[PDB]
Symmetry: C2
Subunit: 213 residues, 2 copies
């Protein structure tokens, strides 16, 4: 029927993504069903393993981001990277971070996981993170995808709907030749690694219908 | 004789690295000859091709950095990322950058090359770059490795000794399993891709001897 119809109806695709996150698997997030659009891999920040971080560095851009809420950004006392944000999407990059303890060169998969876990910990303090670093936090807008339909918001919204703390790891899927993976390559990669697939349009509609009354 | 003795004497290793950069090949930079140390791949910012950027994303951390001088940082009007730098090495990260024209999702190898080329162009202006972005500039300390023996300084020093503008691209070599490549893996990767190998200690000594009188 549609490009993603084999993964369920729009609302089924959301629920399947939630089930995947709860089961320790990844999720592939697309903007819509345009076959020329690209996709991001996402994992819950709480449960992401070193192997999953290794997979993300190996097949992603390597610019592995930590989506967090505004209250977490305030708890970590992380300034936004630029006051006058001139990026095309208004991406909410904060200052970059490194775990203050337990890392060496900080770019290994284990070291980035150590940094992610320090940032999202219950009781995390600003002194638990050095700046700058090699993990890139992204601050989601209040309201999630109902305010801004970005991957940052979609990531957070999916984590809370799955029952996790509002924090997720994301990275863009990259072909081995340096080009970015478009929708058919994203679908094949997700089938190969047992990841669910959902669009941001699916999630917007899901949240609008479920939060009404 | 030594771990790197097959690549020439210390001073020969520098000259071989210069020849490699002039010939359009990469260079593997190590700190010293400790077999447990890690290494970075570097290319001249002027001549780095999309294929070389693809190789860097595929086998590196994906955190692909642009080493620049202070005068270039002033020409681009790029603030340092943090005022109070608390990283272990005092890494000179500026605000991150994106070409203001000619990119889409900005993480593809072609798009990062477009961003690098906009930053290093003769006559580059601050409005040629949006901030934040997906290329990470590094500001070398004045004096190069004679002031600070970091990979940022070594990169710049190698480019100027090779006859290029003082700007180079660097990234840490990553194993496929997520661990960082130590010296034997760096040597094999360099032999496989016809890259020269040099240490920062070689380069410090080279510059001290050649700049005396």
């Amino acid at each position: 029927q549609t490009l993603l119809s084999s993964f369920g109806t729009p609302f089924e695709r959301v629920e399947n993504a939630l089930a995947a996150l709860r089961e320790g698997r990844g999720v592939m997030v697309l903007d819509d069903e345009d076959r020329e659009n690209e996709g991001d891999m996402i994992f819950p920040a709480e449960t992401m393993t070193v192997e999953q971080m290794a997979l993300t560095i190996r097949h992603g851009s390597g610019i592995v981001c930590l989506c967090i809420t505004e209250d977490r950004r305030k708890q970590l006392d992380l300034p936004m990277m630029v006051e006058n944000n001139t990026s095309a999407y208004g991406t909410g990059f904060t200052v970059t971070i490194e775990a203050a303890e337990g890392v060496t060169t900080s770019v290994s998969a284990a070291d980035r996981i150590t940094t992610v876990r320090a940032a999202i910990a219950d009781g995390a303090k600003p002194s638990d993170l050095n700046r700058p670093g090699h993990v890139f936090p992204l601050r989601a807008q209040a309201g999630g995808v109902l305010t801004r339909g970005g991957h940052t918001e979609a990531t957070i919204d999916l984590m809370t709907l799955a029952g996790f703390k509002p924090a997720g790891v994301l990275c863009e899927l990259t072909n081995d030749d340096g080009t970015m993976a478009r929708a058919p390559e994203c679908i094949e990669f997700a089938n190969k690694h047992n990841m669910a697939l959902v669009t941001i349009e699916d999630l917007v509609a899901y949240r609008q219908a479920h939060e009404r009354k």
